[PDB]
């Protein structure tokens, strides 16, 4: 099917505590494969997936160079942001960057991304057409005019449609045995009385990859959207993911409720009933 590559970086300023903390990570789909942490001892881009370990010394040399140069770029951007927003240099602020591309089943380019957030909210982002920018406020409009003048978008468009998807297609090949997998969820139900008249029904999905999944509760064939507790999809730590969805049900009426599970790894969607 389709695949994605994302790089994220996070810069956090810490006045009177040194340079901003800088953490960068790289993913293919839901699989992390590199990281850099300014507080780590190596001061190197490091491997975090087996299939990237095969890259030569030059790869790590160049990746380290770019990511370290980026930490300094976003370091200055944090300072620039202070000016734009007229904020004191006593406060701690955050700058997040995301970049990457999507490809379809055929390996063809599908989508490119390049966007920033300041203190947890949109700052600037490359529009889907890869030719124009979305600025979130008056400060980002300043940056937008700068990037328009410098033709940043045409540079990044070429890179996203070329180098990025080229790199992604390569990683997908190198990590073929693991990255192309689709582990179906193993499903089960738990049931716990909470009083003399109500019971909890919890629908579980475990051991699945990729993380994308849909759990839905129905009562007599109707979505129970408003009464269901859904937890965020979570990593098992072994490369797979977990999720559950629960509903509180009148005792003796369990059989009216059905849990529906949808996932890329299933031949057909599953239905669970207590």
């Amino acid at each position: 099917g389709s695949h994605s590559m994302r790089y994220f970086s996070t810069s956090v300023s810490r006045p009177g505590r040194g340079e901003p903390r800088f953490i960068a990570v790289g993913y293919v789909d839901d699989t992390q494969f590199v990281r850099f942490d300014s507080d780590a001892a190596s001061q190197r881009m490091e491997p975090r997936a087996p299939w990237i370990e095969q890259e030569g010394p030059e790869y790590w040399d160049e990746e380290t160079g770019k990511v370290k140069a980026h930490s300094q770029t976003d370091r200055e951007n944090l300072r620039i942001a202070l000016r734009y927003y007229n904020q004191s240099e006593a406060g701690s602020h955050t700058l997040q960057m995301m970049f990457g591309c999507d490809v379809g089943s055929d390996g063809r380019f599908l989508r490119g991304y390049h966007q920033y957030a300041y203190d947890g909210k949109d700052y600037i982002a490359l529009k889907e057409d890869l030719r124009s920018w979305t600025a979130a406020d008056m400060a980002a409009q300043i940056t937008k005019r700068k990037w328009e003048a410098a033709h940043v978008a045409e540079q990044q468009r070429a890179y996203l449609e070329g180098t990025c998807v080229d790199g992604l297609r390569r990683y997908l090949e190198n990590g073929k045995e693991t990255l192309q997998r689709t582990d179906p969820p193993k499903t089960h139900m738990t049931h716990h009385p909470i009083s003399d008249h109500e019971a909890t029904l919890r629908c579980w999905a475990l051991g699945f990859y990729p993380a994308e999944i849909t759990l839905t509760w129905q009562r007599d064939g109707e979505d129970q959207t408003q009464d269901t507790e859904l937890v965020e999809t979570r990593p098992a730590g072994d490369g797979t993911f977990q999720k559950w969805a629960a509903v509180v049900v009148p005792s003796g009426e369990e059989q009216r409720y059905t849990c529906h599970v949808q996932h890329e790894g299933l031949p057909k969607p599953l239905t669970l009933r207590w």
Binding site: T10, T94, Q96, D119, K121, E232, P235
Partner: protein, 100 residues
């Protein structure tokens, strides 16, 4: 600036079986800012060797982290995750519930 309080989940990699080796997880997500402290507790005492994932974030920019340690559940041992964050007046302690 708008803050977001962590959603906290404490759980085992596999369904718990007493005497069988496993992994205890504490996953914190949907939070901002990123500065956070997460500790795993065994019978009220902080576990010494606990590893965590590299800071990452979701499409809405909110942060997530996984903290984890290998362990072997027994009948009597109680576990919990203690989360220290600016949005919490006092650290939130969530007890591990194995038979969820």
């Amino acid at each position: 600036m708008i803050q977001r309080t962590p959603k906290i989940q404490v759980y085992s990699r596999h369904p718990a079986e007493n005497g069988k080796s496993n992994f205890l997880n504490c996953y914190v997500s949907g939070f901002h800012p990123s500065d956070i402290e997460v500790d795993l507790l065994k019978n009220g005492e902080r576990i010494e060797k606990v590893e965590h994932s590299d800071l990452s974030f979701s499409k809405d920019w909110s942060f997530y982290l996984l903290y984890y340690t290998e362990f072997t559940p027994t009948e009597k041992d109680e576990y919990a995750c203690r989360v220290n964050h600016v949005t919490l007046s006092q650290p939130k302690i969530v007890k591990w519930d194995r038979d969820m």
